[PDB]
Amino acid sequence: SVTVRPDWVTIEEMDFPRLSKLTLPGVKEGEDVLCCGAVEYYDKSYDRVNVKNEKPLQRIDRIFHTVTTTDDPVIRKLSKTEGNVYATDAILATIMCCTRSNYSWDIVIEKIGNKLFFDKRDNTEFDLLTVNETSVEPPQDDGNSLNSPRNLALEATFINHNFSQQVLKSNEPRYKFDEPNPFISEEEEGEVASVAYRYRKWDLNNGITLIARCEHDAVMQTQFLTIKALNEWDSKLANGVEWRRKLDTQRGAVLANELRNNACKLAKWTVQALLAGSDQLKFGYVSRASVRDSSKHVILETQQYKPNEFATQINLNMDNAWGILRCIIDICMNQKDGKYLIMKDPNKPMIRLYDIPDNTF
Ligand SMILES: [Cl-]
Numbered sequence: 001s002v003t004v005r006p007d008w009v010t011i012e013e014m015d016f017p018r019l020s021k022l023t024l025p026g027v028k029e030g031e032d033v034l035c036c037g038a039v040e041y042y043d044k045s046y047d048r049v050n051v052k053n054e055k056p057l058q059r060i061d062r063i064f065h066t067v068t069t070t071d072d073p074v075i076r077k078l079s080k081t082e083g084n085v086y087a088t089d090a091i092l093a094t095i096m097c098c099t100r101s102n103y104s105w106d107i108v109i110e111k112i113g114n115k116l117f118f119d120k121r122d123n124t125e126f127d128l129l130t131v132n133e134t135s136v137e138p139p140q141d142d143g144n145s146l147n148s149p150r151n152l153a154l155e156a157t158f159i160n161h162n163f164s165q166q167v168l169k170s171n172e173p174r175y176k177f178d179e180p181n182p183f184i185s186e187e188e189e190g191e192v193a194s195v196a197y198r199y200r201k202w203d204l205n206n207g208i209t210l211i212a213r214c215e216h217d218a219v220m221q222t223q224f225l226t227i228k229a230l231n232e233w234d235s236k237l238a239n240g241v242e243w244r245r246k247l248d249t250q251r252g253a254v255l256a257n258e259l260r261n262n263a264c265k266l267a268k269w270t271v272q273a274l275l276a277g278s279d280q281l282k283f284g285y286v287s288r289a290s291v292r293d294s295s296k297h298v299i300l301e302t303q304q305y306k307p308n309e310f311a312t313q314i315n316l317n318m319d320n321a322w323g324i325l326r327c328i329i330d331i332c333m334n335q336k337d338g339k340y341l342i343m344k345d346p347n348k349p350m351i352r353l354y355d356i357p358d359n360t361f
């Protein structure tokens, strides 16, 4: 959680009920400005996985990038001639889904004239997934490390990185865009995880033109996929729905529990898929092999959802998502040039925008 400094000046406070009423209907599908990278095909044998046909989770080490907006060389180039607001899908999803968030987060905004850059701070846990964040009683750091919030987060994050690569068909020729991955040399591209980037543009009215990096994890025989893993750590301690007993006949109830307890995580995943234009959101259901060990996991189920329809199922309204973003953009455009910080208050349902000194970070 970022340390609020005494020389930070509050510009605006926004409570969740106000944010929840915001709307900007009519925003079009993103327009591709540049597409990059090479993505692997999904292995449809994983469609046969179920509780009676579980598969061990494999450890597959590939490199993942989560480059912030201003360090992205494609965004730097595009900003010379295109748009006036810049971000990435992960940063946008955090803002757009803020009214679902509980745990703290922050985003830095730099304003130069009529251009805005939204970034994450360097060396933070911004990328980590949360676990049971929106439970009535979230996990507490009361005990050893096995089920602490921090360890649960790293466990979920690790599970997701492995799952997304395991379900790929490594021998199938990849789908390659004309431009390669911008975060690695061609000579070494073999070592990066399967990913395709779409740098997309949106008209948000009032002359606001957003450019942001979006991505897909895989392709399917061409359909583009966003691949994510739900995970079960200890169902009893989580007071959850035991997956090995309930996935066969009550898969919907299991998902419903996930939605209640991981509301922000699931919405941010859905926004990521919608921003990229993925045709499907592919979920794995991954559980510990034993509740007492967080290093070994099994895949119990797989499912796919069309992102537009799934958004409606989790009560995510993109008209509201864009409305929230537009509200924040408008506030920033009215400020003096310089740096600003938006943050979610760790103990209250509100976000605050601060005027921070330019050399703060
Ligand atoms: Cl998350």
Ligand SMILES: [Cl-]
Residues within 6 Å of the ligand: 330, 331, 332, 334
């Ligand atoms: Cl304002």
